[PDB]
Amino acid sequence: PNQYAALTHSQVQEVKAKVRTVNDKFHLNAEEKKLWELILLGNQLAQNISSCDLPTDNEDDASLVKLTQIFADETLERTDLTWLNKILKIALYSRGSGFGNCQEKAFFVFALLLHQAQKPESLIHSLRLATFNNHFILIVNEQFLMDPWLNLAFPLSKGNQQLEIGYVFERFGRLVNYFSINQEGQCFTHTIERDPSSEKDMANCIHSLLDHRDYFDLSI
């Protein structure tokens, strides 16, 4: 039993059941299936990062997860870094250490897809981190929702989107945006605000991800 779990076993099994219901009704085209497979691989790669707040987690990992969480809290409080850089530094620390909770794993997949989005003719166009309280998720191309904490993903019907988000996460409350990058390369940070400092920091941030390419390698 994981005393530190932030959801119950049943709460998890319910979400998985609804993601299954949702994925059954979605029939994707070829290009959507390519991005889909990348999203699945990215979520799966994120499971290298061990959490301690799921019922299936090992309570023996609680202290090393707390170490990442203290690093993350201190990093987010810094005044000398942009928000994009804070997110990426935490992504890198979590992957490098192998420990992180929901926030860290969401940040890692954001970093992975931001890195992938630089590759020639990538299908990655937008990335939106948003939260149900402290439960982070990632919306890709306003077309897919990823939950690396739970290793689940499902498509969204572009337009009406609270039908599937509101179905899967019915008893999870309001989704609040956290940080996003649109197809134009503009950055938004937490109600939403344009984030020109992150925009100006973009290249240096992308460079720091290249310096740990192995953290994000999905190559066959």
Numbering used by the authors: 58 to 247, 254 to 283
Q: Please, what does the article write about this entry?
A:
Ceg10 is an uncharacterized effector secreted by Legionella pneumophila, the causative agent of human Legionnaires’ disease. We then used limited proteolysis to produce a core Ceg10 central domain (T55-R287) that was amenable to structural determination by crystallography. Overall, Ceg10TR is composed of 8 α-helices surrounding 7 β-sheets in a conformation resembling a cysteine proteinase with a putative catalytic triad consisting of Cys-159, His-196, and Asp-204.
We determined the structure of the trypsin limited-proteolysis protected core (Ceg10TR) from three different data sets to 1.7 Å, 1.4 Å and 1.5 Å resolution, respectively. The significant level of trace divalent metal ions present in commercial preparations of sodium or potassium phosphate, and the extended time between initiation of crystal growth and harvesting is likely the reason the protein crystallized in data set 1 has lost the S-nitrosothiol, as metal catalyzed decomposition has been well documented for this post-translational modification.
